[PDB]
Structures are given as C-alpha cells and as structure tokens.
Amino acid sequence: IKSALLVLEDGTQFHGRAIGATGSAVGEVVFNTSMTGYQEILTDPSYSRQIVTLTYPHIGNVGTNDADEESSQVHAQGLVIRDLPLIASNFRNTEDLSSYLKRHNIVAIADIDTRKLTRLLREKGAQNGCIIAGDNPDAALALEKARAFPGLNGMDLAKEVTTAEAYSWTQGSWTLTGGLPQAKKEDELPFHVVAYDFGAKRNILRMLVDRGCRLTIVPAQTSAEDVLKMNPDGIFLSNGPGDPAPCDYAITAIQKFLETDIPVFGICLGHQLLALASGAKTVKMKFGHHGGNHPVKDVEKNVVMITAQNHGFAVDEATLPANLRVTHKSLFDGTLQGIHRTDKPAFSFQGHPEASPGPHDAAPLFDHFIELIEQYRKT
Amino acid sequence: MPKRTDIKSILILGAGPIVIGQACEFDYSGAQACKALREEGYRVINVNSNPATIMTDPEMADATYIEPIHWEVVRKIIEKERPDAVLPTMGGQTALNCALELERQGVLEEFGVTMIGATADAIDKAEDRRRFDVAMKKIGLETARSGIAHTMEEALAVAADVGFPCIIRPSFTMGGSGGGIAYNREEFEEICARGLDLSPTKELLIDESLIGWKEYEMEVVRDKNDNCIIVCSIENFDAMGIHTGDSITVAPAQTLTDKEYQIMRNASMAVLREIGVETGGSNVQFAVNPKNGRLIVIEMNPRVSRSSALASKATGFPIAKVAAKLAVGYTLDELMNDITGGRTPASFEPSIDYVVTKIPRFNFEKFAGANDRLTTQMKSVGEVMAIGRTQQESLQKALRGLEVGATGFDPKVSLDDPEALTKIRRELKDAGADRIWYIADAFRAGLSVDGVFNLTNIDRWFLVQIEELVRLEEKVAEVGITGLNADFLRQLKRKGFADARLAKLAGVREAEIRKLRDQYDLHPVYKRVDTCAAEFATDTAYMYSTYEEECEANPSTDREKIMVLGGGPNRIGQGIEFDYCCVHASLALREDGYETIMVNCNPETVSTDYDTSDRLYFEPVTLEDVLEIVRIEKPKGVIVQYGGQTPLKLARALEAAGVPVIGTSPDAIDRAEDRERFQHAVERLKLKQPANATVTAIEMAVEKAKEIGYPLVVRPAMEIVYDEADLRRYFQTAVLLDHFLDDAVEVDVDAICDGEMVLIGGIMEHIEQAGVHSGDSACSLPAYTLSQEIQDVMRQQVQKLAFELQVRGLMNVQFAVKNNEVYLIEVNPRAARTVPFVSKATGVPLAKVAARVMAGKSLAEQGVTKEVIPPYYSVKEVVLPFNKFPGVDPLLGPEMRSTGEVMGVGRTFAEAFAKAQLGSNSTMKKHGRALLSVREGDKERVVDLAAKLLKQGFELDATHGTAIVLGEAGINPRLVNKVHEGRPHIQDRIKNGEYTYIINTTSGRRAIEDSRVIRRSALQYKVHYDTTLNGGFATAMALNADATEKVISVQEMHAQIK
Ligand SMILES: Nc1ncnc2c1ncn2[C@@H]1O[C@H](COP(=O)(O)OP(=O)(O)O)[C@@H](O)[C@H]1O
Ligand SMILES: Nc1ncnc2c1ncn2[C@@H]1O[C@H](COP(=O)(O)OP(=O)(O)O)[C@@H](O)[C@H]1O
Ligand SMILES: O=c1[nH]cnc2c1ncn2[C@@H]1O[C@H](COP(=O)(O)O)[C@@H](O)[C@H]1O
Ligand SMILES: CC[N+](CC)(CC)CC
Ligand SMILES: NCCC[C@H](N)C(=O)O
Ligand SMILES: NCCC[C@H](N)C(=O)O
Ligand SMILES: [Cl-]
Ligand SMILES: [Cl-]
Ligand SMILES: [Cl-]
Ligand SMILES: [K+]
Ligand SMILES: [K+]
Ligand SMILES: [K+]
Ligand SMILES: [K+]
Ligand SMILES: [K+]
Ligand SMILES: [K+]
Ligand SMILES: [K+]
Ligand SMILES: [Mn+2]
Ligand SMILES: [Mn+2]
Ligand SMILES: [Mn+2]
C-alpha cells in the first residue's frame, strides 16, 4: 500500500493513497470545480505554491498529452483528488496520469473525501497544507510544514516564474485536425505585441498569435523604458501566481505605459497590476474563484459569459479611481471582474479569456485589444 | 427582460398517456412548467389525457382539461379559454405534433394564440430531418452520409447509396419510433414501411452506419439575451446504435478531453442558435469517433425530454421550471438557482462532484415473440438512476435499485458450462437487456477487456471498472466471510457492493453482512446535490449515500417525520399511478405539519423532484438502503403501501428490522397476498371464491381439474385451459388451478378503512370481461351496466374484508359478477393503480386521505365520510405497447401489458367512452366497412352488434362461421376468406384498407395462435379493432357520440359534485 497524507493548517487530516512522486508538498490549498481540463490546470503557472484539489471525482480519465500543457511544467505544488481511474482512455493520451505526475515529480494523493475538503475550504477559507507521500507519512511533521508555510498574502510569485531572458513567440492555437501549428514567420504577423511574463499561459500567447500578433515575451521585471525602446504595437500583461501587490516593478512600469498612448491589456494578475498601477487596491479572497462554469456579466452589454477562473486575489471595486470604469462583474459573488481606463487605451479582465481549460465565452475580450492596436497604428 | 406583459394566460400541451419512449418525465416537466407559470402569476390552462398525472391536479392550474389530445378538441379548449399563448415544449412529441397541427389548421391564428418556448419554425427545423441536415451543413457541422426518402422507391435508392447496415429515422418521431437499423433489404423494407406510415410528415432519413462510435448528449439552455448554458453533459455507456433511452448513460461525460468537450459545447450552442431556440432548453446529440475524436451531430430535440429530466435530477438544475419562465420573457440572469438557496443565478453551468448513472428498465418477459435485442427504436419501459462518488459505486447502486432481482453483477451463466463462452459472446455482440451482466460473466470466463471492447464497443474506461469489480468478487468468494475484515469490507462498500451481493459470494444471508457492518460501524454518509460541487451552500436536503468521511444529512430532531417509499424504476404494472400516490402522501402529510422524507430513484418522476418533499433521498429502494436512512432519520412512520410491489415486498423485513411501518400491517398484507391465508380468511367470512386447487404433478392436476370443472385458470405465464387435452398441452410447454368465470363482469373497488369505518372510494365496471387483466381493461365510473343491488353487495363485501383484514389506509378489491352472483377475485390491501383515476373522477384525493388515516387521522376527523358518486361518467382506457413489438400477437388476456392510460369524461357513458377511445389514439371511424370474425361463444351476441353497425351505416364482412350465424339472423355480410382459405382473404383486405373497423374474438391457445395474422395485420394497418365483444359493444355505443363536442375542466367537473 502506497500511503499518502494531507494535513491542513487547522489540523484536519485526510488519509489516502499516493499517486505521484514520493515526498512532501506544502502550499496553500485550493479547490477547482472544472470537470475536465486537469492537465491544463496542473500546468498553469498561476498554481505555483498551491495545492490543487479537484472537486470532480475521476481525474485522469483521458491520461495526458503535450498539447494540453499550458506551460513548460507542472506548477501545481500538489494534487489532491478523489479517484485515480484504472486507465486513461482517450485517443489523445500519451501517458497516464500517475506516470506524468511521477515524471513531473509531483506529490499527489487520491482516495480522500474531496467534498469535505471543499466544504471546509468554502466555509473557513483557504488554508495552507501539506501532503506527505511515503511508507510512513508523519502527521505531525505534515502539520508542522503546513503551519510553517509562509502564505501567499504578500508573496510575489511572478518574479519566481518569469522567464530569465526575453524571447519571441509566434506559435498559434491547436486544432483537432492538425494539432499545434508550426510557429509562424515574423512577416506572417502584422502586429507586434510585448507580453510581460508574470507566469504566462501558453494559450494566451497562441490566441494572440491567432490574432496576428508576433510576441516578445519579457521577464517580469523589465523596465518600461527597455520596452518602449521596442516600439510595441501593444503591451500585454500576463496571468500568474501569488500576490500582485508586492510587484512594485510591474506596477511601476505599467504606470509608465499609462503615460503613453500605447494600448494595454491585462488578464488576471495582469488585470490586478493594471488596477494597482491605476490607483486601485487589491485584496485576498476568502477562497477565490477556481473553476470553469463561472458566470460573469458584461455590465455594458448585459450579457453573461461562462468563464474559466483561477484567482485568489481581487481588485476592490470601492477603491477604484474615477479613471477606472467597471466593465464586468461576477454573477456568482458580485466581485470585480473587468475594468477599463476611461482616459487610456487600457483595460483588463479577471478571468481567463484564453480559457484552456474551459469555455470559449470570454475570448472576444482579445478583440477589443486588437481594435486598440489597429487604431494606435492608424495614429 | 422581466416577465412578458402582453401575456396573461397560457395553454400548456401535455404528453398524454405513458408509452414506451414517452413516459413520466412529461408529468414531471409539465408539473414543473405549471408550478413555474402559476408562481409567476399567469393564468394556467393545460390539456392532458392522462389522469394519473400531478400536472392534472386541479389545484396545480386554473383550467385543467383531461380530454383527448386531439387537435379538434384542443381547438374547443382554446376557443373556450382564449389563452394568449401556447407552451408546446413540455409534452413530449405529442405536444410538438399537436402544436404544429393546430398551427397548420390555422387555429392559432384564429384565436390569436402565441406560441412561446419554441416557435413552430424552430420545432420544424429540428423535427423535419431534411431541414435539420441542411442546418448542420449551414453551420458547418458534420453529419453522417444520409438521404431523404418519401417513398419506398426513394428509400431503396438511399440504401443503395449508404449501404447496409443503415439507420432509418423518421421525421417528426422520437424514442426511435418507426426507426431501426437495417441489415438487409428485407429488414429495410419493413422498417421503412413502418416508419413512413408513422412519420407525421411521412418522411425518413436513412444514414450510413456509425454503429460503435461513442454517443453523447448535452442539455442546453438559451435565453432571449442569447445567454446560453450547458446544464449537463452525458456520455452513453452503450455506443451509437442502441438508442440513448435503451442505453446505460452517465453524467457527466467521462472520456472527452477539455479540448473536445469545448468543441462539443460550442457545437451544441450553435445548434440551438441555428434551429432558433431562444427561449428554452434543448437536447443535442452527437457521435464521436473514439479513434480520432471526429465529431458528428446526430439530432436535437427542441424541448424537454427524458434526458433533461435525467439531467435535472442529476445536477439539481430544474430545467423545465427554468424553461417555463424563460418562455415568458425572463432571462437566466434574473432567475435564481433554487438549490443554492437562490443565492446564485440560473445563469451558470452546473458542476457535480459525483457520478450519475442511468440504467433502462425492460420487460421483455411480457412480450412473447418480441425481438429482444436493443436497437435504435426504444423498447425500455422505465429507468433507474443512481448517484455515487464513483462510477463503480454509482453503477452498482443503480443495478441494485433496478428492481430486476440484481444485487449487483449477479451471474447469468455458470462457470462450468462449456457453452457459456458462446452465450456470452452472443450477448455481447448483439446486446439485449441482459448485456451488463454478461460483461461481468465474460470477465469471469477469461475474456479480456479488449475482447469485450471488440464485441460491444463500450469504452474500455467503463470495462476495466467492471473487470475490477469481478476480480474483487473473486477475492471475496475466496476469503469468505472470515476474510471480511473492516478494511476490506469498507473497500467493498466504497465500490458500491451491496450487502446482498457480498452475502451471496460469501455464502451467507444478507443480514449477516449487515451485522458485520454494524459491528464495524460501517455506514455510509449522505452527500447533497447542489449544482456546484459544494462551491456554495445549500438549504435543500436532496441526498445520496456513499462511503466517505463527512455526512451532510444533519437530520432534524425537531419534527415528526414520515417516510414514503417509492417503487424504483417504472415497469408494466408498476407505473406512474403509484408514484402519484407517493407524491400525494408527501404533499399531504407535509401540508399537515410532518417532515416528509421521500425515498426513490426513478429520475422521471415528480416524487424525485426536490420540491415534493422536505427531504429527498435519491436511493435504491432496498432494505439495505432504506434501513440506513432510518437509522439516522429515526422517523415516526414509514409508508410502504404506496409505491407498488417494490416497497410492499420490503415491509416484512423492515418491520422486523425495527422499522415503524405505518398503516396496514405487513402481516395483514401477507394475509391477503398469501393464497392460503387469504382463502382461509375468505372462508371465515363466508363469501364467494372460485373453486381452486394447488397441484404438484401433472395427472394430479388433470384430476383436480375434473373437480373444479373447466375452464381453468392455470398459474405457475398464466393461461386459461378449456379441456383435459388443453390442460395437458400447457403442461408440456410449462401450481395454481382456478375455475375460470366465463362471460363474467369484472369490477374494481377502491376504498379506505380507518379501522373505525370504511370509505368506498370507487366502484369501476370493466368494459372487458374477467379474463382480460384489469390493467388492460377499459373501465367505467360509475358502473355502466351493473345493478345497484349487485353493487351494494360488493360494497358490503368490501366492508367486511376491510375490517377483517385490518385495513388501515387504502385497499382495492377485485370482483367477478357471474349470473347475478358475486365472486371474490382478490384483495389488494394497498393503493391500486386505479387510485389516481378514481381521485380524478370523484374529486377525492384518496392517497391524501388514506395517508392521513395511516398517520393517525380518522376519516371522520378528516371530514371524508360519504362515497362520491359523480354526476358524470368517467371512462378509463389503456394504451398498449404492441406497436413497439411487432412480432407479438396484439391480443388481450389475463396478463397485463399496458404501459399507460387515459381518461374520458362525458354526460353519457357513450360520451365518456368515445372520449376515452379517441384519447387512446384509436383509429376508429364513423363509417366504412367492419370485419366480423368471432368465436363460437360470441356467435349469439354478435348479431346485435352487426345490427348496430348496420344502423350506423357500416357495411359488413365476415368469416365463414360468423357469416353463417349472421345469415341465419337475416344479416348477410360479405364473405371474406381466412388466409388459409385463399384470396380474397382478410389479410389482403385489411392491407388494402377495406375496413375501418374489426371485431375479432378468439378463445383457445392454438385458435389464437392460428388467427394471429388478423390481429397483427389489423395493428400494422391502423385499423381500429376490438378483441372483446364487450369492447365491440362499447365502441358501437361511442359511435353515437361526438368527443369534440363538449369540453370540461377538472375544476368545473369537481364543482358539479354534491
Ligand atoms: N448513422 C448512425 N449510425 C448508428 N447509430 C445511429 C446513427 N444515427 C443515429 N443512431 C442511433 O440512433 C439513436 C436514435 O437516433 P435519433 O436521431 O436520436 O432519433 P430519435 O429522435 O428517435 O431519438 C441514437 O440515439 C443512436 O444510438
Ligand atoms: N377465476 C377467475 N375467473 C375469471 N377471471 C379471472 C380469474 N382469476 C383472475 N382473472 C383475471 O385475471 C386477471 C389477473 O388476476 P389476479 O389474481 O388479479 O392477478 P394479479 O396479481 O396480476 O392482479 C384479473 O384482472 C381477471 O381479468
Ligand atoms: O386468417 C385467419 N386465419 C385463422 N383464423 C382466423 C383468420 N381470420 C379470422 N380467424 C378467426 O376465425 C374465428 C371466426 O371464425 P368463423 O367462425 O369461421 O367466422 C375467430 O376466432 C378469428 O380469430
Ligand atoms: C409517442 C406518442 N404518440 C405520437 C406523438 C404515439 C402513440 C401519440 C400519438
Ligand atoms: N447539509 C446540511 C447543512 C447544509 C449547509 N447549509 C451547507 O451548505 O453547508
Ligand atoms: N382496453 C384494451 C384495448 C382494446 C383493444 N382495442 C382490443 O380490443 O384488443
Ligand atoms: Cl413519436
Ligand atoms: Cl473517421
Ligand atoms: Cl418484435
Ligand atoms: K480514504
Ligand atoms: K397572443
Ligand atoms: K429531433
Ligand atoms: K447509445
Ligand atoms: K436523447
Ligand atoms: K376485465
Ligand atoms: K395482486
Ligand atoms: Mn429525437
Ligand atoms: Mn434521440
Ligand atoms: Mn388483480
């Protein structure tokens, strides 16, 4: 019997079985309601330092594949599920779940009451936790580790996941027919956008590429100055893990961009930064939004979108500078989801327009960005 | 955005009587729609010929019409109610068809009736398969290679193109009605002919085969704001080729990657947008090639369905309620989600933290020569649903709640049967109702998962799980009961294993296993359904059992709880009538102040609607499952008498296990059920029972038969034997012997007894004589021929029995009236399937009433003391599934075969009869040529009938003997030859449409067997036919009435009672 254990900051224990690597995992514990999309979710940099619990019982039904990786690696700290299926059963599968987990050296546990954990996290809020997988997983140790966990509040995680050097991205989206495309030639892209890598998802890039943008991915700490030197058609602010607030450099640089007429667009962490750089404040959510069935209303059009969410922090609406107009709101909880600079070509979104995994409902958000771009070039 | 202001009154088109492919799901949906429209302050009008519907309850709507769902009748209703709009998406295909007929007839225009929910164009765009194919092509969605055919010529050309096998699908049909798979020309011709004549647009779509591909469904919802959500995804366990309704299906989808899922999601929304559904739900179907994920759209149903009902139950998202409101201008964003205390909007996509499993319920055993292989045309009669934290756990619970005698994966074949691997291969390759159990037997036999895959095309994802259960079973059998340590036992439980199944394997009684669990403190916890994987709290108590850590039951200590036990999946004989009763008990006792707990697992019903009770446990209605709930609920009383056989069978054990079973005692019931005990009681009371006997051996019976006298009723497949030879005859082919009462009138009496008094609920007179099962008999309330005197004796006999048996709640007594003398057929110390009918006719809600009585409130206390004898005639007629099983002889007998019923209301029995008959989809005409071919005994009576028809202006035909007797009477019918007599023979004439009516009576096994042809031909050709002289008489009577003349609301009717 391959034992495994999960212990929460508060002393709550969950006994199950090991399905990943051998060892220990510590991080903030969250729950995600997506019934499909597990690989994409584990591979999203925004999950770095977090222990991901999946509410949907059977995780691994379709195994895994490269095309379904949202990044260079598994950022999730640990994986907590209810049931690891006997087999992966999908034409796109290249390796079973457990094997991928092991290959990615991830500590994972299965066979536990994810529902009770979910309800606990819902009612009491996020909690730090530790998963120990091995012959004789120590419960006290686990609890120690969880208690010790410094916590995500005030933690800059962007500088930790960002790229080392800048680079180009010209690869577009995947299609059932031909899989992932061959990166385009630079002359195949009208537009040139600079994307700050705060722990950016591949789907965002690919989608931008689908829209005619050749990209220049830059490290999280790049100076506005260095950027501007590049004569960008548009500037993009990626999603990413941790607290946005502590990211002074980003805020600083953005503010700078906001002096200029350069179009700015942000998603999730990007959205928060943009709000910070604009005078708004950020808060830590009780438990956040992590799932793919989240209704968000476009207040302007009075239309609802089913969205993919992944955030533990949010922009406080009652601290929004008058130059900051509310564009979208959560239909689940009234929390802020979109904003637009009344005075500048800049806007952002709390959710993941690029989905992956999740509904395509929010993808049009990208088009406004392209609009801005096109117009800026006119000028 | 809010509610529409231009509309004040709405007409809701009901589904009509229950049929294979169109069942209870429509009472659930219709009741929902009413509730939601009434809630929103609209004036509610509905038509629905099925009286055993909650939707037809008076208090549920403003104007309730239990009338034939005939466009002419609907027109009167409209003319009389002037509804502003009509909601046609909640009554199955009947509602769709009707809506479009009225539209076509220009009735809608005529009375300025606005069609809401789905527009006639959207409905046709979806129902007309030609149009649907075009639409797909427009939006670039892929469909299989197909061809439209309006004639057999047209059709054969397509077959030549697409090749065999090919799928035949009629436009304007559902539940695979009129369709099938054709493996050869002969099959092809047959299905097409049937389909062409069945299609309301006389059209068929014939498609190349995609058999074996994965099959999926998605329940979508769209609003006027273009907001659109996927409420539930469904993956079929059985692949493409077996209708979804005859398939084991699970929610959610299991083997699709997110990428594929999104494609499918988008496609689904595209579908509704192109068809034009903007204010309601719709079911969209797909086929996926597992080898490359190739997506193909199959069809879409612009309304609520059996899947939407399943989805609703599965997710906790009440689709029909929401859809109803969407029909009147509301948008999803404005509606609240019920289960999340309304703290969240309806505009969202549900997320579930468990697996939902549905298994169809079949009844092939009731259909002699029916082909029993599954195909594209539905054959199931019901369904069970179950929920578990795991697929294994979900599937096994469903199996044990299926009401077939399974306790899980019980073996079908033996291990040491050399031939087994043969039977197994067969059962896999060509699926029947038993396949699930064969899959397990195959694994026990050494077949690999790949081996199984290759024969069934069922995803290995599911297969591997069944194999694992097997290996586990083997372990259990190996280690035995001593090997059943708490760890292992818990593993088992968590995998869904039933005590019963472990018991069998371990070779012990089921109670033994339960004891063990009791010793180990091994009990399930209850999780709640919430639509959101627990992301938001719930104030609703809709739960399922599982073997996990935290329990969410949180039973209340505050109230007096009452449990009501449902009947599980529906089957022939155990229909909606029972659920109806169940629902009532809950509503009643809830209203009265009790905390009502409902226990059931039929996803189609109103009883499994969270709104029906205080607490709902969607569980298998088994001793095990029921005892666990009782353990924690610690209720005050349990009602076992209203869900049919399922809960009745449990009564004894429950009580012994300590359950506070209320109303008529288990023992009392046994007194009545038990042949011996009963007979013995009947005696004690000195009443009439037919001469009977219990035989062991053949010759034993031949002699005993001699005693009792012929004809006999032989019960082991129960047959009527007329002579020694016949007796013997049956024996080979083959113990209770009962003297058959020929030419007798069968009566049904429903009533309530509080131990203090007896309330006569209703005395119904069967049109068909004793010998035709009561369940398949048309009946009249009040009696239409029986004398008062004779009726008074019954009343008297009822009362004596009531007291003697110690009835405490409902009972039903069956009588036979022969020669002014009354005989006792049987006693049913419980709620009968006639209860809803009687309640609807008399205005008294017997189920409510008897419920209170069982719960301690006397009839007196209630104020229900006098027997209602309505100022009108109410006639109940049935609907039979013969059309679904062409190989069967479409003839009535002592065994029940009907799936549904209808009610007919009239100022005269003839009126009521004509209404009941039309409502039953009869094809009877008021003119033409009638064919008469009756048995000997009917020879005398047939003259009058022949006379009546002549009077009616019909022309007659008759078989030899029949013509003899007629001529001897001055009636010279036209002679026709029996098939074997040569041309021109009945078969030809029938086929050539020479008759509009047929009266065919037969008696005797071979005699029936030999005349099979006429009845089958009658059915295939659409000629209304009676198989009883009584039925024939009633039909003739109805010739004098006009069912489209007068219409009446239940409310109105009810108000006419004094
Ligand atoms: N080309 C095809 N090959 C194989 N099976 C098919 C094909 N088209 C449809 N089916 C099967 O026929 C069943 C019934 O078809 P459907 O279009 O849904 O008609 P209905 O409206 O009567 O439900 C499907 O659920 C599926 O199993
Ligand atoms: N002795 C009998 N004489 C005439 N008809 C009978 C007799 N016994 C039963 N029947 C017929 O058979 C039907 C079924 O018999 P019953 O004992 O009520 O069986 P079940 O348990 O299915 O109700 C009755 O509704 C009736 O028409
Ligand atoms: O084509 C047929 N073959 C055999 N029996 C038939 C056929 N048509 C009618 N019958 C039966 O013939 C009987 C009437 O026979 P008659 O007495 O000659 O009129 C009924 O019991 C019918 O079911
Ligand atoms: C499926 C219900 N019918 C078609 C709509 C056939 C009995 C009613 C006529
Ligand atoms: N399960 C009984 C209590 C339910 C509670 N309101 C919750 O949602 O946690
Ligand atoms: N109530 C049964 C339906 C009657 C049918 N026409 C028959 O006589 O067989
Ligand atoms: Cl139909
Ligand atoms: Cl293909
Ligand atoms: Cl058949
Ligand atoms: K566990
Ligand atoms: K109108
Ligand atoms: K359709
Ligand atoms: K299927
Ligand atoms: K379907
Ligand atoms: K009868
Ligand atoms: K009975
Ligand atoms: Mn259909
Ligand atoms: Mn279908
Ligand atoms: Mn009976």
Distance CA A365, CA A355 (A): 12
Asked if residue B328 lies in contact with residue B534, where contact means CB atoms within 8 angstroms, the answer is: no
Nearest CA distance, A362 vs chain B (angstrom): 13
B1042, part of any domain: no
Experimental method: X-ray
In the set A9, A69, A268, A294, the catalytic residue is A268
- The DSSP letter of residue A233 is S
Contact yes or no for B353 and A114 at CB 8 A: yes
Question: Domain count of chain B?
Answer: 8
Structure tokens at B837: 């009918």
Q: Which residues of A211-247 are buried (b: 16+ CB within 10 A; e: fewer)?
A: bbbbbbbbbbbbebeebbeeebbbbbbbbbbbbbbbb
Task: Read off the tokens for A366.
Answer: 């990208």
- List the domain boundaries for chain A: 1-150, 151-379
Residue B442's φ and ψ, nearest 5 degrees, are: -65, -40
Q: Verify cis geometry, omega within 30 degrees of 0, for the bond prior to A357.
A: yes
Q: What residues contact B1024, with CB distance under 8 A and at least 6 apart?
A: B922, B923, B924, B925, B996, B997, B998, B1035
- Domain holding B153: CATH number? 3.30.1490.20
Q: In Å, how far are A120, B370, B573, B717, B811 from B895, measured between CA atoms?
A: 56, 16, 10, 8, 21
DSSP summary character for residue A95: B
Whether A294 is catalytic: no
8 A C-beta contact, residue B14 and residue B30: yes
List, in order, residues 6 or more apart from A214 with CB less than 8 Å away.
A168, A169, A170, A184, A186, A189, A191, A192, A193
Distance separating alpha carbons of residues A302 and A283, to the nearest angstrom: 26
Question: Measuring CA to CA, which residue among B114, B98, B46 is closest to residue B77?
Answer: B46
Q: Resolution for this model in angstroms, one decimal place? A: 2.1
Query: Cα dihedral angle (B503, B506, B512, B514), rounded to 10 degrees?
Result: -60
The Å distance, Cα B776 to ligand 6 centre, comes to 8
Of the candidates B357, B266, B301, B242, the one whose C-alpha atom is nearest the C-alpha of residue B124 is B301
> CB–CB of B348 and A332 under 8 A?
yes
Nearest-Cα distance to chain B for A277, in Å, is: 32
Q: How far apart are CA B480 and CA B476, in angstroms?
A: 6
Strands A191-197, B295-301: pairing is unpaired
Which CATH number is B121's domain given?
A: 3.30.470.20
Distance separating alpha carbons of residues B1026 and A14, to the nearest angstrom: 68
Contact: B390, A113; criterion CB under 8 Å: no
Indicate whether B843 and B982 sit together in one domain. no
Written out in words, the top-level CATH class of the domain with range A151-379 is: alpha beta
Within 10 A of B259 (CB to CB), how many other CB atoms are there?
A: 22
Question: Which residue, B182, B210, B238, sits at the end of a domain?
Answer: B210
Interior angle at CA A115, CA A109 and CA A121, nearest 5: 90
Q: Is residue B32 part of a domain?
A: yes
User: In Å, how far is B638's CA from the nearest CA of chain A?
Assistant: 31
In a domain, B346, yes or no: yes
- My answer on whether B355 and B395 are in the same domain is yes
- Check whether residue B907 and residue B929 sit in a common domain: no
In three-state secondary structure terms, B871 is coil
Ligand 5 contacts CB of residue B554 (under 6 A): yes
Instruction: Give the residue from B632, B607, B610, B611 showing the smallest Cα distance to B621.
Output: B607
Centroid of chain to Cα B303: 19
Breaks following residues of chain B (C-to-N distance > 2.5 Å): 716, 734
Q: What b/e string do you get for B606-623 counting C-beta neighbours within 10 Å, with b at 16 or more?
A: bbbbbebbbbbbbbbbbb
Do residue B645 and residue B704 come from a single domain? Answer: no
Residue contact B536–A85, C-beta within 8 A: no
Contact B550, A113 (CB under 8 A): yes
Nearest-angstrom CA–CA distance, B319 and B304: 8
Distances (CA, A) of B310 to B250, B300, B315, B533, B601: 10, 16, 9, 18, 11
Contact between B111 and B319 under an 8 Å Cβ cutoff? The reply is: no
Q: What share of chain B is helix, strand, coil (3-state, %, to 5)?
A: 40, 20, 40
Q: Is the peptide bond before B894 cis (omega within 30 degrees of 0)?
A: no
Is there a contact between B306 and B320 (Cβ–Cβ < 8 Å)? no
* Level-2 CATH architecture, domain A1-150: 3-Layer(bba) Sandwich (3.50)
Tokens of B988: 């030809």
Its domain, for residue B522, covers: 404-553
For B568-583, give the DSSP string.
-S-BTTB-HHHHHHHH
**Residue A313, annotated ligand binder?**
yes
Q: Could you tell me if B881 and B769 lie in one domain? A: yes
Residue B272, domain member (yes or no): yes
Q: Is the CB of B240 under 6 A from ligand 1?
A: yes
What gap in Å lies between CA B634 and CA B650, rounded to an integer?
18
Query: Quick one: B635 and B721 in the same domain?
Result: no
CA distance B1020 to B230: 41
Torsion of CA B995, B1001, B1005, B1006, to 10 degrees: -50
Residue B433 forms part of a structural domain:
yes
- Environment class of residue B833 by beta-carbon count within 10 Å: exposed (0-12), middle (13-18) or buried (19+)? buried
| Claim to verify: residue B367 and residue B440 sit in the same structural domain | no
| Nearest of B839, B845, B834, B341 to residue B591 by alpha carbon | B845
Helix (H, G, I), strand (E, B) or coil at A347: strand
Residue spans of beta strands (DSSP E) within B451-539: 525-528
Q: Is A354 a catalytic residue?
A: yes
Q: Is A269 annotated for ligand binding?
A: yes
CA-based nearest residue in chain A for residue B225: A303
Q: Which ligand is nearest to the CA of B881?
A: 4
What span, in angstroms and rounded, lies between the C-alpha atoms of B389 and A82? 8
- For residue B552 and ligand 5, the question of a CB distance below 6 A is answered with yes
CB-based contact A272:A283 (threshold 8 Å): no
Beta-carbon contacts of residue B768 (< 8 Å; ≥ 6 apart) = B746, B776, B777, B778, B892, B1028, B1030, B1031
Atom index in ligand 4 nearest the CA of residue B21 equals 1
What residues contact B274, with CB distance under 8 A and at least 6 apart?
Answer: B125, B135, B136, B138, B139
Residue B359 three-state SS: strand
B524 CB-near residues (< 8 Å, 6+ apart): B493, B545, B546, B547, B548, B628
Give B29's contacts (C-beta < 8 A, 6+ positions apart).
Answer: B90, B304, B308, B309, B319, B320
Q: What is the DSSP letter of B372?
A: -
Q: Which of chain B's residues have a Cβ under 8 Å away from the Cβ of A15?
A: none
Q: State both tokens at B769.
A: 């004589």
**Residues paired with residue B250 on neighbouring β-strands, in sequence order:** B235, B357
Ligand 6: which residue has its CA nearest to atom 6?
B1026
B476: its two tokens: 């259990």
Write down the number of H helices and E strands in chain A. Answer: 10, 17
To 10 degrees, the CA torsion angle through B275, B281, B282, B286?
110
The reply to whether ligand 1 has any atom less than 6 angstroms from the CB of B245 is no
- Whether residue B1041 lies inside any domain: the answer is no
Query: Are B389 and A360 an interchain contact pair (Cβ–Cβ within 8 Å)?
Result: no
Q: Considering the domain boundaries, does residue B1051 fall inside one? A: no
Question: Do B681 and B824 contact (CB within 8 A), yes or no?
Answer: no
Task: Return the structure tokens found at A115.
Answer: 């529902």
CB of B341 closer than 6 angstroms to any ligand 5 atom = no
Query: Considering only CA atoms, which of A162, A110, A94 is closest in space to residue A5?
Result: A110
d(CA B606, CA B154): 44
Q: Which residues pair with B595 in a beta bridge?
A: B561
B170 in contact with ligand 1, CB cutoff 6 A: no
Other beta carbons within 10 Å of B687? 16
What is d(CA B667, CA B657) in angstroms, rounded to the nearest whole number?
Answer: 14
- Report CA Rg, chain A: 20
DSSP letter at B544? E
B826 among annotated binding-site residues: yes
What is the arrangement of strands in the sheet containing B692-694, beginning at the earlier edge strand? B692-694, B736-739, B712-715, B719-721
Active site residue A130: no
User: Cα(B890) to centroid of ligand 6, in Å?
Assistant: 9
The residues, any chain, with a CB within 8 Å of residue B402's CB and separated by 6 or more, are: B359, B361, B384, B568, B569
Q: Estimate the share of chain A in helix, then strand, then coil, as percent rounded to the nearest 5.
A: 25, 30, 40
**CA A347 to ligand 6 centroid distance, Å:** 72
Domain co-membership, B421 together with B515 = yes
Separation CA B219–CA B322 (nearest Å): 13
Contacts of A314 (CB under 8 A, 6+ apart): A272, A282, A283, A285, A335, A336, A350
Residue that terminates a domain, selected from B868, B895, B921:
B921
User: With contacts defined as CB-CB under 8 Å, which chain B residues touch A356?
Assistant: 258
In a domain, B1058, yes or no: no
Contact B258 A358 (CB under 8 A): yes
Interface test with B, best of A86, A175, A310 (most B CBs within 10 A): A86
